Symmetry: C2
Subunit: 106 residues, 2 copies
């Protein structure tokens, strides 16, 4: 219960105008690989508590944000630092790859 | 090389009329899965020649087929036998799970 659920409208304030690091997961029910990293994320939010905020945005109920970052495929992870994007990963990945990605930017 | 790429029209000929077992992977670039999952299916087409034919159907270039089998999530694997669905599995499975999946149905 540490993962934040974003909406197209709260994206400004929960992410863009928030100080600190936020990992944003762009997903949807119809993409199995997008849902297969959710378990992994639950673990990541716990282990990076205090140094990172994990957020999820279902693109089906919030279709306005993805195009704004030219996202063409899911899942896509957006590591935001103080409001601006720092790094991106496209495609499903193991917990280890995700951890590696975070460690190379936090 | 050994993987048959279908179209909504070659589907009847290449799958519904075939006497043996046909595995169809329903996919699209929209749902990007781990890089390692791509070559897995190619190795399987190899290992299982003699009893199986592997085929892929991009649902974005061929949006006609998926709905006739109630596919809502991708990627999806449809194992066809003599023209009739025998078993399915939703997601991007590892080489090991694919073998387990196939050996339990072939």
């Amino acid at each position: 219960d540490k993962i934040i659920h974003l909406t197209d409208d709260s994206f400004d304030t929960d992410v863009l105008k928030a100080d600190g690091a936020i990992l944003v997961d762009f997903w949807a029910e119809w993409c199995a690989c997008a849902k297969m990293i959710a378990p992994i994320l639950d673990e990541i939010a716990d282990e990076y508590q205090g140094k990172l905020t994990v957020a999820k945005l279902n693109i089906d109920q919030n279709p306005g944000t993805a195009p704004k970052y030219g996202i063409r495929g899911i899942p896509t992870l957006l590591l935001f630092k103080n409001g601006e994007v720092a790094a991106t990963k496209v495609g499903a990945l193991s917990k280890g790859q995700l951890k590696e990605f975070l460690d190379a930017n936090l």
